[PDB]
Ligand binder design. Structure first.
Ligand code: K9N
Ligand code: CL
Length: 115
């Protein structure tokens, strides 16, 4: 059902290696709905190439636009299983500290801070 479940560690690693070869300025991001989530829709896809210069505040804006949310729908984004200490950090920096061992950066969204 989830991404890690669909693809072998081997497959996720080789894919990250190809994105490096072909999309060298992009951060390979996995963005998934919380398995409890009722209110927000599922994304049209799972794997995203995020320009390495955008900060987390702008990545939240991007996903809210992708979900076609309105002003007073709530949106919370976990990175590597936990809260973001800051939304102002560039995603290149966030990748280097919060990346998975397979080389993706893993995010999960919900309408409550209680995931
Ligand atoms: C910044 C951002 C968020 S999702 C996105 C598009 N994601 C992709 O799969 C590729 C097409 C070129 C990047 N762009
Ligand atoms: Cl590129």
């Amino acid at each position: 059902k989830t991404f890690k479940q669909r693809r072998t560690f081997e497959q996720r690693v080789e894919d990250v290696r190809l994105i490096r070869e072909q999309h060298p300025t992009k951060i390979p991001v996995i963005i998934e709905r919380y398995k409890g989530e009722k209110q927000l829709p599922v994304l049209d896809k799972t794997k995203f190439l995020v320009p390495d210069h955008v900060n987390m505040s702008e990545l939240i804006k991007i996903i809210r636009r992708r979900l076609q949310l309105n002003a007073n729908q709530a949106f919370f984004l976990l990175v590597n299983g936990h809260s973001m200490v800051s939304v102002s950090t560039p995603i290149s920096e966030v990748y280097e500290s919060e990346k998975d061992e397979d080389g993706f950066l893993y995010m999960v969204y919900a309408s409550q801070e209680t995931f």
